[PDB]
Write an enzyme that holds these catalytic residues in place. Structure first.
Site, PDB file in Angstrom:
ATOM      1  N   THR A  84      -5.500  -5.092  -4.166  1.00 53.22           N
ATOM      2  CA  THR A  84      -6.249  -3.990  -4.207  1.00 53.22           C
ATOM      3  C   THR A  84      -6.210  -2.584  -2.745  1.00 53.22           C
ATOM      4  O   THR A  84      -5.973  -3.156  -1.538  1.00 53.22           O
ATOM      5  CB  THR A  84      -7.368  -3.266  -4.260  1.00 53.22           C
ATOM      6  N   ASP A 125      -4.861   2.365  -5.551  1.00 54.97           N
ATOM      7  CA  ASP A 125      -3.991   2.227  -6.562  1.00 54.97           C
ATOM      8  C   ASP A 125      -5.025   1.905  -7.793  1.00 54.97           C
ATOM      9  O   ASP A 125      -5.800   1.595  -8.369  1.00 54.97           O
ATOM     10  CB  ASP A 125      -3.140   0.695  -6.279  1.00 54.97           C
ATOM     11  N   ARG A 169      -3.628  -1.456  -9.765  1.00 55.60           N
ATOM     12  CA  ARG A 169      -3.772  -2.144 -10.294  1.00 55.60           C
ATOM     13  C   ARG A 169      -5.064  -3.647  -9.924  1.00 55.60           C
ATOM     14  O   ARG A 169      -5.410  -3.687  -9.131  1.00 55.60           O
ATOM     15  CB  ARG A 169      -2.679  -3.757  -9.604  1.00 55.60           C
ATOM     16  N   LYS A 218     -10.281   2.403 -10.180  1.00 56.05           N
ATOM     17  CA  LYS A 218     -11.359   1.838  -8.703  1.00 56.05           C
ATOM     18  C   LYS A 218     -12.425   2.675  -8.390  1.00 56.05           C
ATOM     19  O   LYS A 218     -13.101   2.613  -7.374  1.00 56.05           O
ATOM     20  CB  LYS A 218      -9.687   1.397  -7.959  1.00 56.05           C
ATOM     21  N   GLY A 221     -12.142  -6.222  -4.067  1.00 51.11           N
ATOM     22  CA  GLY A 221     -12.736  -6.789  -3.762  1.00 51.11           C
ATOM     23  C   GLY A 221     -12.960  -7.688  -4.464  1.00 51.11           C
ATOM     24  O   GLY A 221     -12.213  -7.590  -6.257  1.00 51.11           O
ATOM     25  N   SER A 228      -6.741  -5.386   0.085  1.00 54.95           N
ATOM     26  CA  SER A 228      -5.492  -6.587   0.486  1.00 54.95           C
ATOM     27  C   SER A 228      -4.519  -5.657   0.982  1.00 54.95           C
ATOM     28  O   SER A 228      -3.621  -5.882   1.744  1.00 54.95           O
ATOM     29  CB  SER A 228      -5.040  -7.302  -0.566  1.00 54.95           C
ATOM     30  N   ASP A 285       2.472  -4.125  -0.655  1.00 56.52           N
ATOM     31  CA  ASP A 285       0.807  -5.195  -0.736  1.00 56.52           C
ATOM     32  C   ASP A 285       1.506  -5.801  -1.998  1.00 56.52           C
ATOM     33  O   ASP A 285       1.916  -4.757  -3.043  1.00 56.52           O
ATOM     34  CB  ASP A 285      -0.156  -4.705  -0.835  1.00 56.52           C
ATOM     35  N   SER A 324      -0.721  -4.874  -4.666  1.00 52.25           N
ATOM     36  CA  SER A 324      -1.395  -3.044  -5.472  1.00 52.25           C
ATOM     37  C   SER A 324       0.017  -3.037  -5.536  1.00 52.25           C
ATOM     38  O   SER A 324       0.630  -3.513  -5.722  1.00 52.25           O
ATOM     39  CB  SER A 324      -1.968  -2.187  -3.830  1.00 52.25           C
TER      40      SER A 324
END
Ligand SMILES: [Cl-]
Ligand SMILES: [Cl-]
Ligand SMILES: [Cl-]
Ligand SMILES: [Mg+2]
Ligand SMILES: [Mg+2]
Ligand SMILES: [Mg+2]
Ligand SMILES: [Mg+2]
Lengths: 231, 241, 196, 4, 250, 244, 204, 222, 195, 243
Positions: free
Chosen positions: H1, H17, H19, H33, H47, H129, H166, H169
């Site tokens: 995330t 994002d 994913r 999200k 998380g 992340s 990342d 994500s």
């Protein structure tokens, strides 16, 4: 009348009738006497039987090596209260290595009796107690009433016709208080005191109960042939 | 007739214990009054100290519930202090749980709910008190909210409570008929306190010394009570006009 | 963290850096570690961010309820409430807290509460990972009954060095001044304190 | 977790 | 100490009556009149705002309450009892439904939960029954519009239209003459205002009358945009001004 | 204390009767009559709504007849609120059994447990009993079609035809007269309606004052169907038997 | 001793034009030992279908639990539960056992009877809802299923074409997993007809 | 995330994002999200996915009841206080990392909450992340006194940094704008820079390709 | 414990259970009956942790017998198996779970069909034509896959069972001291004494 | 009627008759007083000598709470002890959490709320005592009197028991004649006089005097009993005034 159904109810004049009725059970009980000098404290108790075939109801109970009491009224209630005293004396020894002061013993009994006079469902204790003991401040005599009131005295008596012994001790006050270092004479004074409460019956060998505690004397009870000396 | 002893319905759908709790409200024989200004909310109450042996500074029916909320009680002091301690605890808990100061109206509702429970649950008696909560709410502005033993509560433009409450009520009604507004159009709280005392004097028909009154003032971010000399200063200002 | 509180003539001043850490990553470079539990009783927080926030919130609640009933609490009382939470929950907490407040009777007071939950009343206290590097400096430079300007310089120079050597400390130096006059917030940026 |  | 009242305070009398429930209904009879009318495309609930004092701000006291975005409630009887029932009703809609199914309960089931709460106050230890009758109006996708009455016993009944409280006998008769199955929402509001004027004595305006509807979705009252499926609450409280507009063409 | 205000709901009279149970039965005798009739190929449940108002919503209403599961239903006589408490308990109990044994609950087992709950309120707890009498109509593969009744005492019995609520004495005499063992469902439907029509306290029996239900094996092959009658269906069945 | 891979198994769901498909294998084993080749992992409550992979005892327990809950739902609501609502019920029930979870991978599939919209959803063991336009996968060959579905799937497939796509997704995924296979079942679901087909697959 | 929050002139904006991963595998290429706690209080969650959704819904439910009880619009600090005390009680075992933002009668607010229950205040924040990739952009381009359109641009740019750099994500950018005095506008799939290219081939099978053993009609009716 | 087998044929269910009880390096008994009659037409065999096995078996037996007396009726094998499964499914998340695996062989009198259920300690239930618990299955399943037919007689089932025991006695490491064989059919439960 | 049979029941007046009945028990008890002085408080009580057999000085009635608060009461003595036991628990938990010894107003409300709680339910009986108590804290001296209803106020002087009116009249004279203040040592002497004067209302049995005091200067802010020379000096002062 309408205010005696339970202990949680005050009367219009501010009386607690259930507590007063509990007090009445003591008056029906057999006479017991307490008195002390500066060195010793003595309990004398007239025991009562059901008939000639029965035993004589034991009136005196040991609480510790240095403390004990006599009872008048409901005997099972005396067993509950004496057991509590045994535990409290014992807690003081195990935790603090300290003999429980006779005064604290009185305070603890007062507070235990009180709780039973302010809550619904319960009932007052139906017994009066005379607690004797020898602690760090010398000899002591206490009078317990199930109202919660505890009183320290030189001498006293509770039960039926206790007024006779109580009057006698009030006259003899100056004499028996100075019977120091003489157990047998202090008992004699107590035996003469309880004799002022007798009617038609006299003190026999399986009728009389004496207990003593003092400076160099653990709390011990005398019954049977051991009280023949004092008749 | 045990339906008059506990909080169950009578044949005519009434709760006599609640009604008798309302009569306990006037046992102190004290009258209170609350009004709103532009920036403030003023509450005043009579102070009667009959015994000469009393410490007059400890005789009070106004309570500081939180920094922002004040409360005046009409009723016996034991029940009054019971209500005050609970309100203080509720206001403190609210702040901890929700991260902002408990509003006056929300505390009023909460205390009104607690009172309602005593009217429905048998083992708990109603408190014989009427609670008037005052503040300057950060959203609603100057606020007066009042609670009774029935569990009823409502906001007020102004209000009065006590034995001679009706006389004070109509006196205030007649003023707001005249002014045509919901509050005292005044800048300073000092003059709103003066208005409150003036109209209480007119309604009750009695004069007051500095020790005959008790005053609480709510402003933005604080509620505070006045000292005898603060009231005396206020009494002098009324007399010189 | 690097934190400290210093008593002086007119009262007490609290000081702190602004770094929060999540490993070697700086999760927050503008953190406020100086926290109000009462009007003129504040605390410096070190250790776990979650633990110290939860404790401070509970203390603030306790003192607010105290004030409603008994009026303004003493600084000692505030420290006692911190202690009670830290001591009784020592197994589950990582919180090094310095309590500082201003009475009119007692003037400025500082209490430090380390990990075990013991209480220590001191003229000044230092705590946090960065404090280790300034024990020598602070002991040599602290004097009792300093002025406001002297105390501000003492804290500024001290935390400057703590920040310089401790990787877990940095950002801005925040300070809170507690006197009879009121409550003053001070901030000092890297460009000033780094070249001291 | 966040530390200070 | 402790609640020693673990026994029922409502019991059967020799004749079979439950005294406390009957007496609770008597308290409802004394209460101010409230009513509800069901239209084809909506529901209206209304009541008089009996002010306790002219110094009191009657806006702060709400007799008509939102329970969910599509369900509203009004009452007759004891106000404090109603207030706590609304608190409990709002909570039970979440705990026993929304937190499980991720959507609000249909009217009949929320009514069923409120009824349960009121039934328990009739049987549980150391409590009296609630001294209120509720009228609950609401909408849900699979049942459409509905109107329910809940009594102190915990019994509930669905209504096309009804009234409760002070002048309920006359008000019900009035509604029988006017109600048909082709009524549009505006026609039902008109009839509600006519019916209420009969029972009201003093002032009759938007400040003394409280009235809410269950009708079309209100996207403007939602508070956000971006989710097509979320279209807003069907419950709407009519303003003081909106009531007065309809009192001119009365 | 609180002893003063205790009615003592779970005690015996000097004659050995339970006061509160007797008084609950007296309450039930004023409730709308409900009739159950068991035929060889199904069961009928018929119940009279309590004095209806013309503005009552009749189609979206449920007062007398409730579904416990797909194979069992109940007719209610007494306090509806009390009945719903018990109905939800019974519904849950049926599902507990199905979850445990992977078989639909036998009718008697459900009836016994619900009756045991009622019994408990008469022996302990100091609470008033449930002012409810049930007629249970259901099917299982052991005994087939079954009718039961339970009352506030928690006592239950099985029946071929039975009535609860008002005018049971008159209703039972009429059922006892015209009932026979080889009876069919459609005949039982007629008997149920005829009996209510004669025992009713109303002027004339109409569709809007009735609830009706059947439990037949009239689905397709060896399976049971519950039919809770709609208003129009009651109107038609009332015409078909010539009552209106 | 990994609860989610003791028994083995897979479930996959797909959407098409006015239809949905849900399929599962038939294996139940104890690690290497194949025990049963009749263990179906798809259940239904009214028109809502639920597939469950993972620990078999929890698969059985949850089926019994959701039958329980949907039966009470229908009695009280007087209507069949819809896929969107049932999805929420599954999520609530799983999260209730947050710190002692059922070791499962459930998959909801069905058509909303009011709107007619095809609906599928997936969950982790503790309730997290995974909604998808296209497909949901679950089980010990989930990696394989993800690969097959992502390549084979196209939108708006007719029921007969959708059957071929979902079947080939499952079969070829199962054959690359030791703990999945031993037979397969596919459900094709239209607005008011449902066809169930058993697939011929390799039995190793 | 990757999730972010950015304050501006007259409010606050949050973005995320879309994913969700399980190990190295992508389960949903378009999950949401951005969560609604109340109409004008929104939250972004990273998380453990089930924890963020469940904790968001529970506090959202209690916030609604609180709003109805107090007859007031809910405040961001109330959601913040309720979330942190819940998370702290569970000692980090509920793995919810949240960015809380919204407008209320007090003003506009932006906070973050960590799993153990610590909270932070800021004008710009990032969690997940991809927070380091996002924070790099925020630290480079953020300034005081941002406009609405500037803040949206900055927020989505920060999310894009996570999407591209990342591995945790990817896919799309969701945005929610909470401005004072206006309705919150949720912008689902505000950017879609990761559209799948046309496949080279259709894998539609000839009908009859799959071998079948048994057919049967399934009864869904009663 | 160790070896328990089950075979469902045309008209009956046959259960075979090893007779050995071993503790350490000593075979303490060679005539142990690892089974309990739950009802006249339902038999349960068991294997697993010492103590747990018998304690669980007898607990189930008591519950089924209680049900039989209460309703004056015999539960179906399917109903009993579901009850047993649920008890094990409860057990697995208890403080100390029952580590017991069972086979339930029953004859349904309403359906006139034999039924065999295999349930492990986790509460994993399956209905099977033949079943086994523990290491036994690793030999018997493949053997039965080859030789089993659904229309076999009781005698054919016993010969099929002899083939399994012979294979186990050849390839199993431990001496399990033979098996006690019991048949469940329309006439109830009986023991084969010469096996 | 029957409104007086159960505690916590309101009468049609709005009164709790059970509490008023508890007040009758207090009026029946012996006299106790409290005098507030310059920098502290003084407490005194009448102990009726029922018999010669009572040990003098050995049935102590005044009780200490913490180390800075004194308590005396009239009415049912056991009820008073129960209240003091609670007071001691309340004071201990305050000092535990907040470190500082409990302030007197804070302590007063702790007793007040506890006694008030015993008027809320029919399952408890109201306290059959009025309690006079006080001490010295950070804000100086405080004297309080608490009644069965839970009602309490601060007092310049306080009295309760059978001779309360006699004592009150004597207290009012001290307040009038000493507007600036009374010293601690003077208040001890005055306390003796007032108990002796209040003994006229209980003059069948002769009595024993018991005094205690808290003073910032004289006792260093701690509660102490007045004994020996200071007690005999106070007795002699009282004896001289009655004649
Ligand atoms: Cl509340
Ligand atoms: Cl922090
Ligand atoms: Cl640190
Ligand atoms: Mg009550
Ligand atoms: Mg650094
Ligand atoms: Mg394979
Ligand atoms: Mg293989």
């Amino acid at each position: 009348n309408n205010y005696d159904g339970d202990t949680v109810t005050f009367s219009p004049t501010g009386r607690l009738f259930q507590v007063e009725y509990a007090l009445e059970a003591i008056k029906q009980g057999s006479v017991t006497v307490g008195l002390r000098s500066n060195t010793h404290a003595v309990l004398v108790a007239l025991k009562r039987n059901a008939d000639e075939l029965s035993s004589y109801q034991k009136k005196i109970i040991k609480c510790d090596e240095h403390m004990g009491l006599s009872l008048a009224g409901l005997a099972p209630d005396a067993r509950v209260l004496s057991n509590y005293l045994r535990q409290q004396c014992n807690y003081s020894s195990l935790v603090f290595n300290r003999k429980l002061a006779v005064e604290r013993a009185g305070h603890l009994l007062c507070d235990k009796a009180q709780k039973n006079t302010q809550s619904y469902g319960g009932r007052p204790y139906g017994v009066g107690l005379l607690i004797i003991g020898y602690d760090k401040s010398g000899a002591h005599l206490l009078e317990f009433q199930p109202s919660g009131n505890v009183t320290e005295l030189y001498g006293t008596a509770i039960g039926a016709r206790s007024q006779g012994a109580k009057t006698y001790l009030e006259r003899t006050l100056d004499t028996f208080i100075k019977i120091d270092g003489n157990p047998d004479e202090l008992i004699k004074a107590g035996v003469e005191a309880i004799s002022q409460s007798l009617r038609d019956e006299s003190l026999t060998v399986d009728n009389l109960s004496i207990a003593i505690v003092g400076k160099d004397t653990p709390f011990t009870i005398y019954d049977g042939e051991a009280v023949a000396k004092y008749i | 007739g045990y339906d008059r002893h506990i909080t169950i319905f009578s044949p005519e759908g009434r709760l006599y214990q609640v009604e008798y709790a309302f009569k306990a409200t006037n046992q102190t024989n004290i009258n209170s009054l609350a009004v709103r200004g532009k920036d403030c909310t003023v509450v005043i109450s009579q102070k009667k100290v009959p015994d000469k042996l009393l410490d007059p500074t400890t005789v009070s029916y106004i309570f500081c519930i939180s920094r922002t909320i004040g409360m005046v009680v009409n009723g016996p002091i034991p029940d009054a202090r019971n209500a005050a301690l609970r309100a203080k605890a509720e206001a403190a808990e609210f702040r901890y749980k929700y991260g902002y100061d408990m509003p006056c109206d929300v505390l009023a509702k909460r205390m009104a709910n607690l009172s309602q429970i005593y009217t429905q649950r048998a083992y708990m008696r109603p408190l014989g008190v009427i609670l008037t909560f005052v503040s300057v709410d950060e959203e609603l502005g100057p606020s007066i909210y009042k609670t009774d033993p029935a569990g009823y509560y409502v906001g007020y433009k102004a209000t009065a409570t006590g034995p001679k409450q009706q006389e004070i009520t109509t006196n205030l009604e007649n003023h707001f008929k005249k002014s045509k507004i919901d509050h005292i159009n005044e800048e300073s709280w000092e003059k709103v306190v003066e208005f409150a005392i003036t109209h209480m004097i007119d309604a009750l028909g009695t004069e007051f010394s500095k020790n005959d009154l008790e005053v609480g003032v709510a402003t933005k971010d604080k509620f505070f009570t006045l000292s005898a000399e603060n009231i005396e200063e206020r009494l002098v200002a009324i007399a010189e006009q | 963290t690097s934190i400290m509180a210093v008593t002086f003539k007119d009262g007490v001043i609290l000081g702190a850096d602004s770094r929060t850490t999540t490993g070697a990553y700086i999760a927050n470079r503008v953190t406020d570690k100086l926290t109000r539990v009462h009007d003129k009783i504040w605390c410096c927080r070190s250790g776990s961010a979650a633990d110290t926030q939860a404790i401070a919130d509970i203390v603030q609640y306790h003192l607010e309820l105290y004030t409603s009933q008994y009026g303004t609490p003493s600084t000692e009382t505030a420290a006692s409430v911190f202690k009670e939470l830290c001591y009784e929950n020592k197994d589950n907490l990582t919180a090094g807290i310095i309590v500082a407040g201003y009475d009119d009777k007692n003037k400025g007071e500082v209490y430090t509460i380390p990990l075990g939950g013991s209480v220590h009343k001191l003229p000044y206290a230092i705590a946090g990972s960065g404090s280790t590097f300034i024990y020598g400096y602070c002991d040599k430079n602290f004097r009792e009954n300093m002025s406001k300007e002297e105390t501000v310089d003492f804290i500024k120079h001290s935390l400057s060095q703590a920040i310089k050597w401790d990787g877990s400390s940095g950002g801005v130096i925040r300070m809170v001044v507690l006197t009879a006059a009121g409550v003053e917030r001070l901030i000092f940026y890297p460009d000033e304190y780094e070249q001291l | 977790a966040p530390l200070x | 100490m402790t609640d020693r009242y673990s026994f029922s305070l409502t019991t059967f009398s020799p004749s079979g009556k439950l005294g406390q429930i009957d007496y609770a209904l008597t308290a409802v009879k004394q209460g101010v009149t409230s009513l509800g009318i069901k239209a084809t495309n909506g529901v209206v609930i209304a009541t008089e705002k009996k002010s306790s004092s002219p110094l009191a701000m009657s806006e702060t006291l709400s007799k008509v309450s939102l329970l969910t975005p599509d369900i509203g409630a009004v009452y007759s009887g004891m106000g404090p009892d109603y207030r706590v029932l609304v608190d409990k009703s709002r909570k039970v809609a979440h705990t026993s439904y929304k937190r499980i199914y991720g959507e609000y309960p249909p009217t009949k089931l929320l009514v069923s939960e409120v009824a349960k709460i009121m039934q328990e106050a009739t049987q549980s230890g150391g409590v009296r029954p609630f001294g209120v009758s509720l009228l609950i109006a609401g909408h849900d996708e699979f049942n459409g519009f509905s109107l329910y009455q809940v009594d102190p016993s915990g019994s509930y009944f669905p209504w096309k239209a009804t009234a409760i409280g002070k002048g309920s006998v006359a008000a019900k008769t009035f509604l029988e003459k006017r109600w048909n199955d082709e009524l549009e929402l505006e026609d039902a509001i008109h009839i509600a205002l006519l019916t209420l004027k009969e029972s009201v004595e003093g002032e009759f305006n938007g400040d003394t009358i409280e009235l809410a509807i269950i009708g079309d979705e209100n996207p403007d009252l939602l508070g956000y945009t971006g989710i097509p499926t979320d279209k807003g609450p069907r419950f709407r409280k009519l303003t003081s001004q909106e009531i007065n507009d309809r009192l001119e063409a009365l | 204390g609180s002893r003063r205000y205790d009615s003592r709901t779970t005690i015996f009279s000097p004659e050995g009767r339970l006061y509160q149970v007797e008084y609950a039965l007296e309450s039930i005798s004023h409730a709308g009559t409900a009739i159950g009739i068991m035929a060889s190929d199904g069961i009928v449940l018929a119940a009279e709504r309590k004095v209806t108002s013309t503005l009552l919503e009749q189609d979206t209403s449920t007062e007398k007849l409730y579904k416990l599961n797909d194979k069992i239903a109940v007719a209610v006589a007494g306090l509806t609120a009390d009945a719903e408490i018990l109905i939800n308990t019974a519904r849950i109990h049926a599902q507990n059994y199905l979850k445990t044994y992977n078989e639909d609950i036998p009718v008697e087992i459900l009836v016994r447990r619900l009756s045991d709950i009622k019994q408990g309120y008469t022996q302990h707890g100091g609470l008033r009993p449930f002012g409810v009498s049930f007629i249970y109509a259901g099917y299982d593969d052991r005994y087939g079609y079954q009718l039961y009744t339970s009352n506030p005492s928690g006592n239950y019995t099985g029946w071929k035809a039975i009535s609860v609520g008002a005018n049971t004495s008159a209703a039972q005499t009429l059922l006892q007269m015209d009932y026979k063992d080889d009876m069919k469902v459609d005949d039982a439907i007629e008997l149920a309606l005829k009996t209510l029509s004669k025992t009713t306290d109303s002027s004339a029996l109409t569709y809007d004052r009735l609830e009706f239900a059947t439990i037949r094996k009239g689905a397709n092959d060896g399976e049971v169907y519950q039919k809770i009658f709609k208003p129009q269906e009651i109107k038609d069945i009332l015409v078909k038997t010539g009552i209106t | 001793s990994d609860p989610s891979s003791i028994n083995g198994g897979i479930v996959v769901a797909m959407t098409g034009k006015d239809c949905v498909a849900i399929a599962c294998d038939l294996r139940l084993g104890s690690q290497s030992l194949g025990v049963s080749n009749k263990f179906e992992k798809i259940f239904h409550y009214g028109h809502v279908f639920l597939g469950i992979t993972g620990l078999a005892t929890d698969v059985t327990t949850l089926n019994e639990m959701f039958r329980y809950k949907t039966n009470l739902y229908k009695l009280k609501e007087e209507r069949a539960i819809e896929p969107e609502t049932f999805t929420q019920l599954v999520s609530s029930s799983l999260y209730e056992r947050r710190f002692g979870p059922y070791f499962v991978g459930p998959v909801v599939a069905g058509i909303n009877s009011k709107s007619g919209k095809p609906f599928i959803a997936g969950f982790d063991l503790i309730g997290c809802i995974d909604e998808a336009k296209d497909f949901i996968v679950s089980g010990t060959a989930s990696d394989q299923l993800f690969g097959m579905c992502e390549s084979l799937y196209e939108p708006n497939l007719e029921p007969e074409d959708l059957f071929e796509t979902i079947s080939q997704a499952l079969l070829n995924a199962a054959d690359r997993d030791a703990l999945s296979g031993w037979g397969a079942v596919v459900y094709i679901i239209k607005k008011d007809e449902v066809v169930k087909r058993y697939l011929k697959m390799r039995q190793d | 995330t990757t999730i972010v929050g950015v304050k501006f002139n007259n409010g606050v904006v949050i973005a995320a994002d879309t994913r969700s991963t399980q190990g190295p595998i992508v389960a949903d290429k378009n999950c949401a999200k951005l969560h609604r706690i109340s109409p004008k209080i929104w939250c972004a969650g990273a998380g453990t996915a089930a924890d963020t959704e469940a904790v968001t819904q529970l506090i959202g439910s209690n916030i609604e009841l609180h709003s109805l009880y107090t007859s007031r619009e809910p405040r961001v600090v109330s959601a913040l206080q309720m979330l942190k005390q819940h998370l702290f009680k569970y000692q980090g075992h509920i793995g919810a990392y949240l960015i809380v933002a919204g407008v209320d009668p007090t003003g506009s607010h932006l906070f973050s909450i960590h799993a153990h229950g610590s909270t932070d205040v800021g004008y710009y924040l990032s969690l997940g992340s991809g927070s380091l990739a996002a924070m790099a952009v925020l630290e480079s381009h953020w300034k005081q006194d941002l406009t609405k359109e500037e803040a949206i641009k900055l927020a989505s740019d920060a999310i894009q940094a996570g999407i591209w750099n990342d591995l945790g994500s990817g896919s799309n950018v969701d945005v929610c704008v909470m401005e004072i005095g206006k309705d919150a506008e949720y912008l689902r799939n505000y950017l879609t820079p990761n559209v799948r290219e046309e496949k080279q081939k259709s894998y539609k099978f000839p009908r009859g390709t799959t071998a079948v053993l048994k057919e049967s009609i399934v009864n869904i009716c009663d | 414990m160790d070896i328990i087998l089950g075979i469902r044929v045309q008209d009956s269910v046959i259960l075979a259970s090893s007779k050995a009880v071993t503790r350490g390096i000593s075979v303490l008994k060679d005539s142990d009956d690892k089974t309990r009659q739950l009802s006249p037409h339902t038999l349960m065999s068991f294997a697993g942790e010492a103590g747990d096995t018998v304690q669980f078996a007898e607990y189930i037996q008591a519950n089924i017998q209680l049900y039989s007396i209460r309703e004056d009726y015999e539960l179906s094998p399917q109903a009993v198996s579901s009850f047993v499964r649920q008890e094990l499914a409860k057990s697995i998340r208890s403080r100390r779970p029952y580590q017991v695996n069972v086979l339930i062989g029953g004859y349904d009198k309403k359906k006139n069909k034999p039924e065999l259920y295999q349930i492990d300690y986790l509460g994993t239930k399956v209905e099977l034509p033949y079943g086994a618990h523990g290491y036994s299955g690793f030999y018997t399943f493949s053997l039965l896959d080859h030789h089993y037919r659904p229309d076999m007689t009781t005698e054919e089932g016993l010969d099929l069972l002899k083939l399994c025991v012979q294979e186990l006695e050849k390839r199993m490491p431990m001496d399990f001291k033979g098996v006690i064989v019991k048949i469940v059919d329309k006439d109830g439960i009986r023991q084969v004494d010469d096996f | 009627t029957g409104y007086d049979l159960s505690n916590s029941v309101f009468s049609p007046d709005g009164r709790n008759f059970q509490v008023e009945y508890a007040v009758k028990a207090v009026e029946n008890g012996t006299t106790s007083i409290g005098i507030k002085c310059n920098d502290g408080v003084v407490f005194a009580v009448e102990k009726l000598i029922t018999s010669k057999l009572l040990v003098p000085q050995k049935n102590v009635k005044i009780q200490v709470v913490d180390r800075h608060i004194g308590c005396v009461y009239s009415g049912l003595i056991p009820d008073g002890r129960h209240l003091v036991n609670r007071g001691r628990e309340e004071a201990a938990s305050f000092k535990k959490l907040y470190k500082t010894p409990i302030p007197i107003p804070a302590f007063a409300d702790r007793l007040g709320q506890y006694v008030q709680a015993h008027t809320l339910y029919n399952s408890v009986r109201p306290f059959g005592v009025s309690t006079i108590f006080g001490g010295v804290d950070k804000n100086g001296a405080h004297l309080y009197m608490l009644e069965p209803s839970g009602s309490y106020w601060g007092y310049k002087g306080a009295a309760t028991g059978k001779g309360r009116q006699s004592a009150k009249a004597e207290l009012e004279k001290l307040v009038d004649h000493h507007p600036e203040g009374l010293s601690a040592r003077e208040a001890v002497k005055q306390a003796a006089k007032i108990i002796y004067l209040a003994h006229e209302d209980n003059k069948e049995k002769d009595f024993e005097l018991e005094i205690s005091w808290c003073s910032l200067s004289e006792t260093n802010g701690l509660h102490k009993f007045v004994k020996g020379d200071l007690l005999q000096e106070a007795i002699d002062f009282a004896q001289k005034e009655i004649n």
